């Protein structure tokens, strides 16, 4: 009925607790489940919704052959209630190989990019109808966050990039009210490559932690002022960098002004947020592959450059199990905003050659001020029992 302002303090986070799991790959050997990649959780004020970039096919299907491709005309954005697996009764809200969904408190906004790589169309759909569209401004490949956008007082911010993944790319921040782009803003600051941002509201603005694919093994931070439409950029000052291709803990570095130039040539989506001077950060256990996933808290990692003091480590996924994209989303509570993160679990080809498809499962954790324990939540599907 009314817009979302996120004008509540960020409550105390002593760690994270298990919230949800979708056993899509396990259920898909004896069932009808979509083949998906790049999911994200976005919550309306009543509940939480899971989103995925489907491939226009089920897993027990002939069209699951060669599903490793990322930009396909049959890809659609799948929407479900969080916990309901992606069965044949799901809703395809738009055509997209890149998407970003958010709720302003009144309706849903979906940003959906589809078409040719050289000439792509980003459609902005609000309240079930198409309200706007743009094309590529650099004609390389038009991409969005692949996570949730942030809406404050009816203004939603989407980070969209177009250009080389191994070079300079034009990154813009689009401010949209009710499906209509009211402003665009070029990226400004010290960040040199911004891709696949994970954004959370930090009142009165938005803070995004993104992925550098050119020279940075550390994560760039984009701060967005939604009233002045202004953008500033920096990097994370935590020495323990949070990108999948990275150096070991002894030789990693981040002075949060420039890319560290260590092994930044690729990465994952990733996420991080700030609690005072400290940083809560989730990364993969492996330093070269997307296997494993831990989360921890670095003391003075948002204020002191190159800080490697680590406390409160939780093993979300063990080293021997595959992981993937990870992103953030904020949930309004009774008196505070709580942070939560989703982790992808990629099962399929280019690592496992016993099958022909490539799909994912999702595990969702939420922060808590209370006591937690330890555990392990992998995908847990026997790849020899799968079609």
């Amino acid at each position, epitope marked *: 009925a009314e817009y979302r302002n996120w004008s509540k303090p960020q409550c105390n986070i002593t760690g994270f607790a298990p919230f949800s799991k979708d056993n899509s790959i396990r259920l898909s050997a004896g069932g009808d489940i979509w083949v998906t990649r790049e999911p994200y959780v976005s919550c309306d004020p009543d509940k939480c919704y899971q989103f995925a970039l489907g491939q226009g096919t089920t897993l027990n299907n002939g069209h699951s052959n060669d599903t*490793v*491709h*990322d*930009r396909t005309p049959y890809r659609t954005l799948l929407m479900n209630e969080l916990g309901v697996p992606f069965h044949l009764g799901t809703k395809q809200v738009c055509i997209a190989w890149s998407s970003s969904s958010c709720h302003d408190g009144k309706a849903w906004l979906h940003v959906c990019v589809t078409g040719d*790589d*050289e000439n792509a169309t980003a459609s902005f759909i609000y309240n079930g109808r198409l309200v706007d569209s743009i094309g590529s401004w650099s004609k*390389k*490949i038009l991409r969005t966050q692949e996570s949730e956008c942030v809406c404050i007082n009816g203004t939603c911010t989407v980070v969209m990039t177009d*250009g*080389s*993944a*191994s*070079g*300079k790319a034009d990154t813009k921040i689009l401010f949209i009210e009710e499906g209509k782009i009211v402003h665009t803003s070029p990226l400004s600051g010290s960040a040199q490559h911004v891709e696949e941002c994970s954004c959370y509201p930090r009142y009165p603005g938005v803070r995004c932690v993104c992925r550098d694919n050119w020279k940075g093994s550390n994560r760039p931070i984009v701060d967005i002022n939604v009233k002045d439409y202004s953008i500033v950029s920096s990097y994370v000052c935590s020495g323990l960098v949070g990108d999948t*291709p990275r150096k070991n803990d002894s030789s990693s570095s981040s002075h949060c002004l420039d890319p560290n130039n260590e*092994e*930044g*040539g*690729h990465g994952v989506k990733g996420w991080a947020f700030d609690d005072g001077n400290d940083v809560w950060m989730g990364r993969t256990i492996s*330093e*070269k*592959l997307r296997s494993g996933y831990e989360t921890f808290k670095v003391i003075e990692g948002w204020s002191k450059p190159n800080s490697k003091l680590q406390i409160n480590r939780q093993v979300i996924v063990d080293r021997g199990n595959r992981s993937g994209y990870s992103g953030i989303f904020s949930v309004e509570g009774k008196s505070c905003i709580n942070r939560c993160f989703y982790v992808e679990l990629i099962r399929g080809r*280019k*690592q496992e*050659t016993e099958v022909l498809w*490539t799909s994912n499962s999702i595990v969702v954790f939420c922060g808590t001020s209370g006591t937690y324990g330890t555990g392990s939540w992998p995908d847990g599907a026997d790849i020899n029992l799968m079609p």
Partner: antibody
Amino acid sequence: QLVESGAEVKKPGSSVKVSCMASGGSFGSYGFSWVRQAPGQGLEWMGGIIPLFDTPNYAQKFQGRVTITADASTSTVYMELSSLRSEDTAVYYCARDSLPYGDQNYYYGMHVWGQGTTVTVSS
Amino acid sequence: SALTQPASLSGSPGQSITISCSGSSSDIGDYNYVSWYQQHPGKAPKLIIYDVTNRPSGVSDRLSGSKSGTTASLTISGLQAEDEADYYCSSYGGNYNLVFGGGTKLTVL
């Protein structure tokens, strides 16, 4: 199928341009690579380019000498080698990935190979 | 170069020959992107193995690939006369760089 330019003789200190065009379908998102083979020696990877992004990558031993350009509409890649020396006599191949650029396909895979061009640099 | 290989190998028609390719951690090791190419004299290189174990269509099933720690192996089972060639190993060293190995000259007797 990758067509390539003709063999050209050169003088030391000059500059040579090699061209390779993919006939195929449309390959702009695909990654092209340039490989040098000295007569009798092995294969060395000069560099690569995605014609759509137009941001080349070079080997450490070739940074400063090789310029790689591309035309995405024609999917034609060009390699300019300047300051030709004695040990630039070789056969140059252009290879291309069988899959387009993606999250799981970022390294320059080299699946389809061209016929090659010889460059002779001596006098 | 960065990846080491046997200078030459020999075998009899009918047996199996394994070609090794060793490297550092930034080389074959992590980043399991290892390709094997086969070159006959006077012709362009031909991809026979990509992604450590996978094999392109049109390549004989007698060629197989494997990885152990920091080395890769190419196994040719049932040597014939058409398998006499130069075999090369390449890997992805990171930061958009590919590293080759000095080729081996497989000759059947």
